[PDB]
């Protein structure tokens, strides 16, 4: 399952290992579409790594400080430090790649 994460506590719930975090809206039509194969790819690293969904329009904050100016935006984290980012929609088998390239 994926974790919803806020302003609030970003930085409580990715301080941790490995983390993929999904900067999503509900006005968002390619989000929609990956957020089906994120659902999958959490299960295929369950153990391994964190997927976490932040809703931008709910916490403007944490997407000005990534700098996420358009979303799809996917953001791999290393022990609380931004890695990797992914823009657009992206099949699994790019998204897992990303992935194994951090852990």
């Given at each position: 399952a994926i974790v919803k994460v806020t302003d609030a506590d970003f930085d409580s719930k990715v301080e941790s290992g490995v983390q993929l975090?999904?900067?999503?809206?509900?006005?968002?039509?390619?989000?929609?579409?990956?957020?089906p194969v994120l659902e999958e790819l959490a299960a295929d690293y369950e153990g391994k790594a964190?997927?976490?969904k932040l809703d931008v329009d709910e916490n403007p904050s944490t997407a000005?400080?990534?700098?996420?100016?358009?979303?799809?935006?996917?953001?791999?984290?290393?022990?609380?430090?931004?890695?990797?980012?992914?823009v657009g929609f992206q099949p699994k088998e790019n998204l897992a790649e990303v992935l194994d390239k951090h852990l």
């Open positions: 975090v999904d900067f999503w809206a509900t006005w968002c039509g390619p989000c929609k579409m990956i957020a964190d997927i976490l000005a400080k990534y700098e996420v100016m358009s979303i799809p935006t996917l953001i791999v984290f290393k022990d609380g430090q931004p890695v990797d980012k992914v």
